[PDB]
Amino acid sequence: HMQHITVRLPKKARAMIVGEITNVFKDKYPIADKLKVIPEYDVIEQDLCKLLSPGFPKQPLRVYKFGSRITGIGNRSSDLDLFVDIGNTFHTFEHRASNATVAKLRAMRKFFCDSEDWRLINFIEQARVPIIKTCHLPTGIECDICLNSMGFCNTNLLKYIFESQPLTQYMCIYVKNWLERCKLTEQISTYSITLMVIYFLQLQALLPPIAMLQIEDAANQAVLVGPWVVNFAQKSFSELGLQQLKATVPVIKGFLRNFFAYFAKFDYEHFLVCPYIGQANVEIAKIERMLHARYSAYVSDNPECSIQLKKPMVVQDPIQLNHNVTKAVTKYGLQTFVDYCQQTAELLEEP
């Protein structure tokens, strides 16, 4: 659509970008760090167990917290994501929820509804990942409750990445806020652009390929959720041979300029963002042959569950390798993102 005219960067974004990088982080980073762990979360998880256990007597029940609060890029308005594991379902993968999973979520709904400690906000059973959205009234924190473990698994990977290489965390706080000010979150999520930051830094030799953390040998076995390897070697970057930078304003600004310039000129027709492989120029035409043998076997028995590559923008989840997290980005949404990237890189320059 008017592909010959650049989509103008929104003024709400422009003001943030041309304003000092300091003001971006002065409050936001300390807040995000603090929100990795606060006692409110223990209250939420204790209340969730007490609420739901009677509904599932004799089954084990464990609560796993995840999402932006837990990884260190949240703010006070952020939700908290919770995987409720009833009956040791952690290692079970369902690309689309099973009838059994849906029946469980439907049963859980009335508990939040009847309970005075919880306000039911929405019940979403048609999504790829069905969720219950509910406010925990004693803390006021909005919670997304799901029934599979993949988000928790990628949260733990992000936490390792952010703690090892804090530049990654600063960059993700910045680009999260940039997406919001650009009004792009309908199309590109915080998690998607987090994977884009990770991939970009892998290309700079500042983060390992995820595949390199998941070598399967005598010393290292996989934790499998269905066909997906969800654990990783928690090696020091010293051992990996990767330098660990101190995030300063000038360091952050230079890496952000290069991030936006890179994705402004990325060839989305032929290549995908691929933190699994962590190397430059990963071809859409080749990725499905570059994955572990479990992927090929999984698609054989689930032929409609292969990664969706016939899409404008391909960003592959590094653990759930059949998931293009940007599969809903349209041609015009991608043009908009590219144009906003181009204009942001321009405003971060300083000859």
Residue numbers in the entry: 200 to 550
What's the paper's own text on this?
Three complex structures of Tailor-AGU, Tailor-AGUU and Tailor-U4 (Tailor-UUUU) we obtained in this research were respectively designed to mimic the post-catalytic states of the addition of the first and second uridines as well as the extension of polyuridylation chain. As indicated by the structural analysis, the terminal Us in both Tailor-AGU and Tailor-AGUU adopt a very similar conformation at the +1 position (U+1) as their equivalent nucleotides in previously reported structures, interacting with the surrounding residues through extensive direct and water-mediated hydrogen bonds, as well as hydrophobic interactions. More specifically, the O2 carbonyl group and 2′-hydroxyl group of U+1 make two direct hydrogen bonds with the side-chain group of N353. Furthermore, the side-chain of T354 contributes to the generation of water-mediated hydrogen bonds with 2′- and 3′-hydroxyl groups of U+1, while U+1 base forms hydrophobic stacking interaction against the aromatic side-chain of Y390 and an additional hydrophobic interaction with the main chain of V542, as well as a water-mediated hydrogen-bonding network with D515, Q519, and H522 from NRM loop. At the 0 nucleotide-binding position which is occupied by a guanine (G0) and a uridine (U0) in two complexes, respectively, protein-RNA recognition modes are similar but not identical. In Tailor-AGU, the O6 carbonyl group and N7 imino proton of G0 form totally three hydrogen bonds with the guanidine groups of R327 from the loop connecting β3 and β4 strands while the NH2 group of G0 is involved in a hydrogen bond with the side-chain group of N347, ensuring this guanine is specifically recognized by Tailor. Other than these direct recognitions, G0 base also makes water-mediated hydrogen bonding interactions with the side-chain groups of N347 and Q519, and a hydrophobic interaction with the side-chain group of V328. 5′A at the -1 position (A-1) in Tailor-AGU is less restricted by the interactions with the protein except the hydrophobic interactions with I323 and I330 and a water-mediated hydrogen bond between 2′-hydroxyl group and main chain atom of V328. R327 and N347 are key residues in forming direct hydrogen bonds with G0.
